[PDB]
Design a protein around this ligand. Structure first.
Ligand SMILES: [Mn+2]
Ligand SMILES: [Mn+2]
Ligand SMILES: [Mn+2]
Lengths: 154, 153
DNA sequence: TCAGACTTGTCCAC
DNA sequence: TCTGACTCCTGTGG
DNA sequence: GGGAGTCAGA
DNA sequence: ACAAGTCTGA
């Protein structure tokens, strides 16, 4: 568990609140238990001209990746454990995306017990909904009701 | 000279590098000596839904204003004296717009000596070009060569 | 099976 | 003369 | 985000 | 920014 410098977390919080994104997703997973996979993603977006800035993040955070998609690049962290460690420390400084961060931390911690009953799983799916609500969601498909419909059919 | 909290400057520098903007503009003006005035602007942009975040920023910086147009609000500061004081403290924490900040500070310090000789004024406008060059400029019209053409008369 | 790497799309928030 | 507040718009980088 | 403009006041 | 996806390994 890496400890991060405070002045680093303070700057990063502002940048994340500006050009970053905290994402919770319910992904279709046929080869699975409830046909639905959960995905948590911390993401920092920036133009490829400044890919170096996002490259620095990989070294400073210690994990994550940088991929290209047009004229724009993104930093990408989805690995649950370093994600929980990173968001735990960044959260006290976030202003605009603090609640999304907290819901993600809360989803991660309740993740193993959500693999049990579908009821507990669907409850966690509703927490995914709230994150999308707090973001500027525009192109969302799979929600908690998309899970319930497939689950009640079973 | 209101001095700002270091933790506040660190967070703000991050938000400025992300959603902020440091703008140097060469505006035309017939009443003015060289037919062109200069304007420096610190700008933080956010949708009106989160205008409150910009409202806090005004109270925190003490100076500035929030303007609305469409679905987006904006904090702005163009008052030279408070802007110079503010950018001075904010500069060391900037990472993506640090060069823009320093150039603006450079322009401001060479401002009273720019209203003198045309050759000096052209040099200051060249600094404005660099700022637009460092930025993601896409709608710029008046450059230093525009001033050059007008100056030859 | 399943989390994690890596890609593609779109609408707007800058 | 001259500055700064204020509005509106484009074209992306988120 | 990063300009273009117009205006009232100083 | 906020999604939507594919596919490979253990
Ligand atoms: Mn933003
Ligand atoms: Mn940005
Ligand atoms: Mn942004």
């Amino acid at each position: 568990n890496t400890k991060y410098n405070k002045e680093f977390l303070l700057y990063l919080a502002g940048f994340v609140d500006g050009d970053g994104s905290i994402i919770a997703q319910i992904k279709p997973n046929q080869s699975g238990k409830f046909k639905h996979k959960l995905s948590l993603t911390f993401k920092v977006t920036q133009k490829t001209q400044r890919r170096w800035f996002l490259d620095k993040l990989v070294d400073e955070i210690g994990v994550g990746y940088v991929y290209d998609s047009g004229s724009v690049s993104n930093y990408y962290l989805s690995e649950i454990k370093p994600l929980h460690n990173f968001l735990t420390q960044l959260q006290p400084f976030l202003k605009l995306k603090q609640k999304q961060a907290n819901l993600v931390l809360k989803i991660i911690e309740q993740l193993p017990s959500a693999k049990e009953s579908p009821d507990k799983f669907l409850e966690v799916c509703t927490w995914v909904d709230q994150v999308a609500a707090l973001n500027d969601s525009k192109t969302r498909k799979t929600t908690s009701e998309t899970v319930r419909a497939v689950l009640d059919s079973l």
